[PDB]
Amino acid sequence: MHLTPEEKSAVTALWGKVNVDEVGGEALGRLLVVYPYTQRFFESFGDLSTPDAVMGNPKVKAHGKKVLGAFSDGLAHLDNLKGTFATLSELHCDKLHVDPENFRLLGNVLVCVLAHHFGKEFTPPVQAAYQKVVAGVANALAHKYH
Amino acid sequence: MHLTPEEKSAVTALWGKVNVDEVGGEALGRLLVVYPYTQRFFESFGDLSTPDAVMGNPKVKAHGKKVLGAFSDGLAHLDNLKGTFATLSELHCDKLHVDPENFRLLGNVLVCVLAHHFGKEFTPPVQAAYQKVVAGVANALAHKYH
Amino acid sequence: VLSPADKTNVKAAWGKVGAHAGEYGAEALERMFLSFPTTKTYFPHFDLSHGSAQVKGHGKKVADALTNAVAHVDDMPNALSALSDLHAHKLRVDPVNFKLLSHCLLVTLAAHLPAEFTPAVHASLDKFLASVSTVLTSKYR
Amino acid sequence: VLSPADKTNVKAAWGKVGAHAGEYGAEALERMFLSFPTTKTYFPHFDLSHGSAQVKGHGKKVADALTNAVAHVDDMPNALSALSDLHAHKLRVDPVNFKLLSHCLLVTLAAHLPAEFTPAVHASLDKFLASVSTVLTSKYR
Ligand code: HEM
Ligand code: HEM
Ligand code: HEM
Ligand code: HEM
Secondary structure (H helix, E strand, O other): OOOOHHHHHHHHHHHOOOOHHHHHHHHHHHHHHHOHHHHHHOHHHOOOOOHHHHHHOHHHHHHHHHHHHHHHHHOOOOOOHHHHOHHHHHHHHHOOOOOOHHHHHHHHHHHHHHHHHHHHHOOHHHHHHHHHHHHHHHHHHHOOOO | OOOOHHHHHHHHHHHOOOOHHHHHHHHHHHHHHHOHHHHHHHHHHOOOOOHHHHHHOHHHHHHHHHHHHHHHHHOOOHHHHHHHHHHHHHHHHHOOOOOOHHHHHHHHHHHHHHHHHHHHHOOHHHHHHHHHHHHHHHHHHHOOOO | OOOHHHHHHHHHHHHHHHHHHHHHHHHHHHHHHHHOHHHHHHOOOOOOOOOOHHHHHHHHHHHHHHHHHHHOOOOHHHHOHHHHHHHHHHHOOOOHHHHHHHHHHHHHHHHHOOOOOOHHHHHHHHHHHHHHHHHHHOOOO | OOOHHHHHHHHHHHHHHHHHHHHHHHHHHHHHHHHOHHHHHHOOOOOOOOOOHHHHHHHHHHHHHHHHHHHOHHHHHHHOHHHHHHHHHHHOOOOHHHHHHHHHHHHHHHHHOOOOOOHHHHHHHHHHHHHHHHHHHOOOO
16 A cells, blocks of 8 residues: 555545545445445345435445444554454455455445545545555455455 | 465476476467457567467567566565566566556466466366466566556 | 436436536546556557646547447447447557546546436446447457 | 357367366366455355365356357357346346456366367357356346
């Protein structure tokens, strides 16, 4: 995870303006609407049959809040993503059985969600730093797969 | 290169038995035939219209030897793939303009090729270690891109 | 495959794009060049400085061809035929790169079209770009 | 799109596999789980140990669908429709994994059928597993 101080500053600064609860909700929802096969993991969440059903589902919203919560905490340990997410990695592999490729998909949607919210301020330079951060998190989450 | 002791040993021993001239010419040729769009870098080698023309082409053969020659020397530096291939990365990005994705393709062909030659001896465990080296080598070859 | 709904969603969104397409094409490219530097290996004869004119001129071109495909949404493989031959026989860009570009167009559209970039649209736009990338790639071998 | 030379190549290679299809599918599976461990997440109900009966049976199953596809080379989408529904609507396996199993099937064939795994035959089997993979992910969204 080679981020430059200018990049790290760019990532940390924008992140201060994010409302994680809501952004968390948009990103998990969109992921389930744009890549409907990712619903294989949430049969217990109830109705995910139409976009409104997904986006407004309370369970989808609470899980997105929880997913982004761990993400943010990662943003404060950008020099030790691997250690920060080790236990999470283990969980997603041995108990939940999640194909890591799904972390890459969420990363990319997150980037569309950030672009949608901040418009102009998500400049190309700022998107490049965020691509490196989403890739680094996805790799940290796959590190303990075996 | 999270290589296991018995993985390192599985790689070294098998390699000591490779005829680099042949395996190289076959690897590169097969790449030109199976992924024909890779011929874009090799316009100046001559006729490449047909598989026979590719596999017979001497410049293909010679360039193959050179490529596997450097991969070969890389197996002696497995603890330090990045530093070994630094210069070669710079050249591939700066003068040659080679999309690193091509490194993955050659890798996978390389592996079909060792199976074809060694048959029985190229067991699943042994393939698993070569997939690690090959990805490791592509990753190092791509490290200095900008 | 695109559904009646997808087609309708893509026409609506691209309609709002209107005459900024070029500009958005260029931005898509610049985003691509910075986020995924390996993609610059296909443009070594280009000036890639910010604001460069080859990038702008090329952005327009990309945008015209996407605009053409929206106009011929029911006959895309035929409307894009020439571009498909060109990419398969002369340019020979590795297929993974098409996804990279498609991602950057989405980010670009999202940043400029807050109200139209709903979840349903994002989705349809994403299937749309994937179909375009599939056609341009269909004759590679 | 598979050409006549490809169809022909595929039929002849698969023909020699003949009665070892099941063993080879099982082998390929086994190589994929060892080489690409992420693929295991789709089989948490299976006993993945070497020589397990689940991997075995699953081996023959995949191998047979493949036979049915070579034998139906001209009409794959129809031939594989139900298998294509199964993957899009139930199993929901991420597209990326189809390339990993494909490569493993090539290596298994390269290793068992040396004389037949010529460069053009390798080319042709590679396009064929790709169209099968395309067919199997066609109704994902
Ligand atoms: C940014 C990447 C991700 C992070 C940081 C993350 C984090 C978390 C956290 C903190 C939990 C709760 C842990 C617990 O229950 O003890 C969780 C659970 C879970 N996650 Fe992940 N997650 C990520 C991506 C994903 C994605 C992409 C998928 C699947 C598409 C996924 C599927 C699940 C499932 C099924 C649960 C358990 C839900 C339940 O309570 O039934 N996660 N994740
Ligand atoms: C296994 C990974 C690879 C290695 C280790 C490798 C290695 C090398 C080496 C040692 C040279 C000699 C450069 C010199 O003379 O200073 C070279 C040149 C070259 N390589 Fe690579 N190569 C790899 C993969 C590829 C790929 C896949 C391609 C394109 C598909 C490629 C394209 C080239 C080209 C175009 C040259 C220059 C040829 C010439 O002199 O005209 N390489 N490579
Ligand atoms: C959405 C997908 C894409 C579309 C619609 C598209 C369309 C076009 C068009 C219209 C041209 C102009 C050719 C002419 O003069 O008639 C072109 C050229 C070109 N494209 Fe594609 N393109 C796409 C994706 C890509 C990607 C992913 C790459 C590689 C990263 C790429 C690389 C090139 C290159 C190098 C040229 C030639 C540039 C020059 O030398 O002037 N394109 N493309
Ligand atoms: C050429 C590509 C593939 C073909 C032709 C194929 C074919 C099949 C077949 C014939 C079945 C059995 C259906 C039945 O019970 O009647 C099946 C099921 C299944 N496949 Fe696919 N498959 C392919 C690739 C994959 C991929 C790459 C994976 C993920 C790594 C995968 C995961 C599964 C799973 C988890 C099942 C259900 C297993 C069970 O519970 O018995 N398949 N597939």
